Design a protein around this ligand. Structure first.
Ligand code: ATP
Ligand code: ATP
Ligand code: MG
Ligand code: MG
Lengths: 465, 187, 501, 254
């Protein structure tokens, strides 16, 4: 046991006698109503450790009694965690009874070794036509999701959960790092009304970890570790192809530079911590493709003060492999999903990774979508008919391409009434290889709006008139 | 490292670190009363103008201030562990704070039989029957088998009452019952 | 004024008799730990910068000696250490295993294998904190170090013993210059002329662990892992292991330099080292300077890049070439760190992020790329042809239906497209000098600009076959004489008549 | 020092909170449980937007429909005593001081009394949320609470940070605004609506405290000074003002 000597804010100091616990352990205060977990961070000498709290600190008397677990924070893990909501210490917070499982795991765990990594790049297919063609997803890589509210982001989250559990058979974890309570309640009920979570049986496809915004600054930084332990169970024990959602990554960085300033350390550049490059290192290197399975991560990125070279969105950018941006100017055009095709980049887009068939198809799409972007200004200012006859087809074809990128989702079958289509990879490359050559140009525009493959396009030209 | 016994007061400072490290070595080997009789005589043999000089005088050296003290503590009475304590205080330059370590040790050794005495501060000293009655009801309050000590102070600013402290308790029956007449105003 | 070793656990050892069963000369305890450094009490015979060993198996460097304690910089994680441990004294300055028997392994920064192939089998150990050679043993560079890239070997030539920077933004092709240098040495290491052999060392600082693993395959796929060492301290390693990574990497190259061999080392990158030295400095409460850096960042990179030198013929005649990598934030070549290293190295190579987007690859800024000392050490065959292309690439840059403008704007685009190069295709020296010959002697001035990448892949593929025995006299004699250039006139003008436009 | 309700006792915001300003209810609406930030410079009508929202709820507060009444609380943090004495008389004239409470921690009062006073108003606005009623609270203003708390930190020798604020000024404002919630029918159906006022300097919202409270709340109302003198009064910029409950808090007519 130990005793509390000093209570200053959200920093408690504990005095032990014999069993001095190492760093990154977890203590537990005796005599209080709810669990208050302290995490050891420094050995201060004369048998005294420096702990950061994880809940409210008031009501603590100098000289109480504090036990020791002898291990780090251990959470309930398993396959029966699918469809539940937990905080950073594994407790359930939806009043549906205690989670019961066989084994536990610790959140502070080392990276995989050098002889276990994958030696080759490999594309993850998710079914969407705009994602898997122009900005494809590597297996194990980190993905950055630009865009916020009012663009249609929370549908794209709920649909990538559904398609990987269909074409690949791998579940997902959602980790809310310092997220609002009002917006972390609507995502609970939006997933219920779309089937990906289920209150009646064991066909759920996600596990929710919610460390909300009104919690102490030590408890908002470990949530992205608790929500990575669960994602490591479905790779190390079963060998699935897991996904991982963090929303967002800036509230993991910013919650780090408030523990490192409550602990009395000199700040680095503009206000961050000295250790900005290892806390991003000792988290995002556990997200990798081992020999058993993989973990892929889609992360939301908020840039402060529109500065792309601020050290919080500059440390993160060295880890990403592909970025997709949700433009609001395509949402007022009618296209869903509202993914910009020109301002998305991929690192694995390469003739020696995805082959030459994927390459020269997806290269020509972004070139033709630039010529319509340059010719749309002469038409708006000067007029229409002055341009050549070779340019009138590029105006007509690029309005066929940017509507063939639309696709009806399976998560929206109740509302918009259409059928949700999941397109494999070999249909999307075959489709755009024919639109470029003028092979299906005589058909009108609305045959291409909101279809599946290229086969269902010509079956919709017959119903017009 | 090895473990060390905790004192029942646990004071802090640069003088409490030296009254604790001696209490963790003299509670071992059962010598807590031999050091106390020695420490109440090393307080006498420091405050002589031959010896109070050239210990606070900074321009001598460290080592020759040890040798002028390593034989002074060796010849008269002492060869316990406490001779290393004076040898350690002169090495660290902390020879000035030697009354601070001694005065801390007496209260740390007091609580092994002591009671943290009282304070009755009302007026002129009264008759004997009022004194023996408070000394025989406060004996019923300690419940620890220890013969309580007490001090009396004179303070005429309190009108007709008395304040009494038992350790860290501090009951109150004084002129603050006149300050409780704000209920006629604040209501 | 309260003292680090005024605690009650150390006063008790003194106040209860001066205890005999504690060493306090070769072994000590640990008083505190957690900010990196540890406060070790005892160890009264430790030297400065001497490696110690903890009870958990971690090495640590004795950085800071005090009258009370010792401050030990801990290599690796500091969770395994606890207050109250026992630390042993090795008895030697921090040194790494070094020798010929490391070519083919992947070690970490302390010299232990992490490729899973057993121990290394080394016999000699050199320190990491040695000094550079003085003014007497050095001499000017004279042997050329080929790159295999058509833009580097003809415009910014390198030589054996010359520092050269590679500076640019993220995802501009920085590492893909350093990889093609290692694969291009396949032609020399598998020959009989021992005087042209050249080894390689790669140091990966702060990178991802899954990018080094996909790199050692690409070297094994091209038979390039039999003369290459790799030191690796990736982004999950601790901060002292990234700081001491280029010192142990350079001490393995100093072995070949002093024993008559030539080496080559690529630090990748020195930007992520200086953000690791910043962390250890501010965790010791040192006064920050510009951009919260410590005051001695210039001592960090100068005492490392001064070792890369060429000894004279009385010292063996070896060399050591370095090629550090700096990453800039949005073209900022006026910041604190990319000016502390421009004022050290003997030239630059600039990689533009707005020529990498326009399709020119490798996106080498020819205007800002210079190499001072390495210009006098190149092949006279290359100097006879690339001295002309230096002129026309200048006259294309001022003009950015008129007379004397639409002539240079015609040739100046055919030479820009001539300097594109595919990935992982290192060309030989004498095959370059025929392709740069056709672009500066005025033969492809008539063709279209889009059909000139097709032209280089057709002319080289045939003259390597039907005129193979007639190309060897360029590489053997080392120059273009009056009989070779009169012969070279007929090879091109007969190929343009057969090349279908 | 109580906590917020969790995820389960909340429900989505649907009822309208009527302000009475033609530009607020048309383009940037407020539901009954939303947090909406009134941000702008000095002297641009930030107090006046939050003083007719108290006056406008008189038409429901004298009627019969019990589930449409609203109760208003106003917290003044560090203003002079004569200004509060002018604002009570404005709310006495419009007969709107029979359902309003005013919590005044003025400029002369001590440094910790300007720290408790935001947390001494939510505890009076949570008694109406706990008992099935509706409420409204206005913090005027929150940028003078982060200053009265910085003085208490640096005199207690705590490690400073950016602009000499401590490391937990985000934890100071988050656990005050998260107490505003829309409860569900199993707990009573109550609500609490929070309107904090934040004063920028030279229109720079990228400071320390103007970026903490922006990322906590839902939408902002950005009052400029240029439009105030060009004739547009109230000077609401609808180019930069948003609300992320959207159109789900407007009536079907509006
Ligand atoms: N000569 C070339 N031709 C075509 N593509 C190239 C060429 N050189 C590099 N690339 C492309 O550039 C991409 C990135 O190159 P590289 O890895 O060198 O960037 P980098 O600057 O090292 O990235 P980072 O430093 O951020 O890790 C590679 O995937 C490769 O496909
Ligand atoms: N709708 C309006 N039309 C015309 N004038 C107005 C309007 N609203 C407010 N004003 C005037 O603006 C002046 C200042 O407004 P107000 O005090 O509300 O601004 P404020 O920024 O909240 O003040 P402070 O900077 O002291 O917080 C008042 O004198 C008031 O008369
Ligand atoms: Mg690289
Ligand atoms: Mg005002």
């Amino acid at each position: 046991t130990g005793r509390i000597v000093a209570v200053i804010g959200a920093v408690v100091d504990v005095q032990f006698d014999e069993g001095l616990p190492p760093i990154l352990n977890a203590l537990e205060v005796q005599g209080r109503e709810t669990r208050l977990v302290l995490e050891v961070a420094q050995h201060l000498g004369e048998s005294t450790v420096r702990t950061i709290a994880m809940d409210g600190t008031e009501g603590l008397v100098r000289g109480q009694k504090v036990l020791d677990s002898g291990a780090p924070i251990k959470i309930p893990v398993g396959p029966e965690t699918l469809g539940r909501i937990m905080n950073v210490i594994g407790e359930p917070i939806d009043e549906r009874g205690p989670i019961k499982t066989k084994q536990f795991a610790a959140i502070h765990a080392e990276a995989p070794e050098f002889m276990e990594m994958s030696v080759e790049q490999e594309i993850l297919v998710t079914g969407i036509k705009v994602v898997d063609l122009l900005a494809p997803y590597a297996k194990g890589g980190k993905i950055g999701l630009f865009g916020g509210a009012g663009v249609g982001k929370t549908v794209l989250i709920m649909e990538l959960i559904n398609n990987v559990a269909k074409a690949h058979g791998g579940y997902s974890v959602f980790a809310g790092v310092g997220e609002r309570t009002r917006e972390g309640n609507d995502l609970y009920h939006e997933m219920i009304e779309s089937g990906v979570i289920n209150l009646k049986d064991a066909t759920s496809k996600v596990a929710l970890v919610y460390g909300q915004m009104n919690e102490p600054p030590g408890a908002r930084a470990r949530v992205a570790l608790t929500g990575l332990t669960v994602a490591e169970y479905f790779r190390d024990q079963e060998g699935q192809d897991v996904l991982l959602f963090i929303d967002n990554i800036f509230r993991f960085t910013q919650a780090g530079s408030e523990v490192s300033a409550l602990l009395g350390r000199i700040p680095s550049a503009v206000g961050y911590q000295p250790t900005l490059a290892t806390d991003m290192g000792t988290m995002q290197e556990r997200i990798t493709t081992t020999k058993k399975g993989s973990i892929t991560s889609v992360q939301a990125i908020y840039v402060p003060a529109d500065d792309l070279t601020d050290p919080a969105p500059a440390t993160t950018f060295a880890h990403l492999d592909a970025t997709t941006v949700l433009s609001r100017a395509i949402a007022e055009l009618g296209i869903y999903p509202a993914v910009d095709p020109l301002d998305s980049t991929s690192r694995i887009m390469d003739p020696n990774i995805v082959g030459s068939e994927h390459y020269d198809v997806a290269r020509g799409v972004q070139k033709i979508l630039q010529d319509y972007k340059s010719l749309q200004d002469i038409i708006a200012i000067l007029g229409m008919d002055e341009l050549s006859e070779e340019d009138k087809l590029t105006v007509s074809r690029a309005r066929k391409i940017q509507r063939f990128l639309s696709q009806p989702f399976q998560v929206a079958e109740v509302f918009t009434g259409h059928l949700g289509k999941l397109v494999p990879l070999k249909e999307t490359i075959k489709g755009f290889q024919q639109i470029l050559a003028g092979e299906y140009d005589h058909l009108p525009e609305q045959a291409f709006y909101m279809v599946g493959p290229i086969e269902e396009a010509v079956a919709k030209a017959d119903k017009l008139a | 490292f090895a473990k060390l016994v905790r004192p029942p007061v646990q004071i802090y400072g640069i003088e409490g670190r030296y009254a604790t490290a001696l209490y963790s070595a003299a509670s071992k080997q059962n010598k807590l009363e031999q050091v106390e009789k020695e420490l109440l005589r090393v307080a006498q043999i420091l405050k002589e103008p031959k010896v109070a000089a050239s210990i606070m005088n900074p321009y001598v050296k460290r080592s020759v201030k040890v040798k002028s003290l390593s034989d002074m503590t060796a010849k008269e009475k002492f060869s316990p562990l406490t001779s290393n304590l004076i040898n350690l205080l002169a090495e660290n330059g902390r020879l000035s704070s030697t009354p601070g370590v001694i005065s801390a040790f007496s209260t740390m050794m007091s609580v092994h039989r002591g009671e943290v005495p009282c304070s009755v501060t009302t007026a002129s000293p009264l008759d004997e029957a009022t004194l023996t009655e408070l000394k025989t009801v406060l004996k019923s309050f300690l419940s620890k088998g220890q013969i309580l000590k007490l001090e009396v102070k004179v303070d005429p600013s309190i009108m007709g009452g008395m304040i009494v402290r038992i350790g860290e308790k501090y009951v109150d029956m004084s002129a603050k019952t006149k300050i409780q007449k704000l209920s006629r105003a604040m209501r | 004024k309260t003292g680090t070793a005024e605690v009650s656990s150390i006063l008790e050892e003194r106040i209860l008799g001066a205890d005999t069963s504690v060493d306090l000369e070769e072994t000590g305890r640990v008083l505190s730990i957690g900010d990196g450094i540890a406060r070790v009490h005892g160890l009264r015979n430790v030297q400065a910068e001497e490696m110690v060993e903890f009870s958990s198996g971690l090495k640590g460097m004795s950085l800071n000696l005090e009258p009370d304690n010792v401050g030990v910089v801990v290599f690796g994680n500091d969770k395994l250490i606890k207050e109250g441990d026992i630390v042993k004294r090795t008895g030697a300055i921090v040194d790494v295993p070094v020798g010929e028997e490391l070519l083919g392994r992947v070690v970490d920064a302390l010299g232990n294998a992490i490729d899973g192939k057993g121990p290394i089998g080394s016999k000699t150990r050199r320190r990491v904190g040695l000094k550079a050679p003085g003014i007497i043993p050095r001499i000017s560079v004279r042997e050329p170090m080929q790159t295999g890239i058509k833009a580097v070997d003809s415009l910014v030539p390198i030589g054996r013993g010359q520092r050269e920077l590679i500076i640019g933004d993220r995802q501009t092709g920085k590492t893909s210059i350093a990889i093609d240098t290692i694969i291009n040495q396949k032609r020399f290491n598998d020959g009989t002329d021992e005087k042209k052999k050249l080894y390689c060392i790669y140091v990966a600082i702060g990178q991802k662990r899954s990018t080094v693993a996909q790199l050692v395959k690409r070297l094994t796929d091209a038979d390039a892992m039999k003369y290459t060492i790799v030191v690796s301290a990736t982004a999950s390693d601790a901060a002292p292991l990234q700081y001491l990574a280029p010192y142990s990497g350079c001490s393995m190259g100093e072995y070949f330099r002093d024993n008559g061999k030539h080496a080559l080392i690529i630090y990748d990158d020195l930007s992520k080292q200086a953000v690791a030295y910043r962390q250890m400095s501010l965790l010791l409460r040192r006064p920050p300077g510009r951009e919260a850096y410590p005051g001695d960042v210039f001592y960090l990179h100068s005492r490392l890049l001064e070792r890369a030198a060429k000894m004279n013929d009385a010292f063996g005649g070896g060399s050591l070439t370095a090629l550090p990598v700096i990453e800039t934030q949005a073209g900022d070549v006026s910041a604190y760190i990319p000016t502390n290293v421009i004022s050290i190295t003997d030239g630059q190579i600039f990689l533009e992020t707005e020529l990498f987007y326009k399709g020119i690859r490798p996106a080498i800024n020819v205007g800002l790329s210079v190499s001072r000392v390495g210009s006098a050490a190149q092949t006279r065959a290359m100097k006879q042809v690339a001295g002309t292309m230096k002129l026309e690439l200048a006259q294309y840059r001022e003009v950015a239906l008129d007379a004397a403008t639409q002539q240079l704007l015609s040739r100046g685009v055919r030479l820009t497209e001539l300097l594109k190069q595919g990935q992982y295709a290192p060309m030989a020296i004498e095959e370059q000098v025929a392709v740069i010959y056709a672009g500066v002697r005025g033969y492809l001035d008539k063709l279209e600009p889009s059909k000139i990448t097709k032209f280089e892949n057709a002319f080289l593929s045939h003259v390597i076959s039907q005129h193979q025995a007639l190309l060897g006299k360029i590489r053997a004699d080392g120059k273009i004489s009056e009989e070779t250039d009169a012969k070279l006139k007929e090879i091109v003008t007969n190929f343009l008549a057969g090349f279908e436009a």
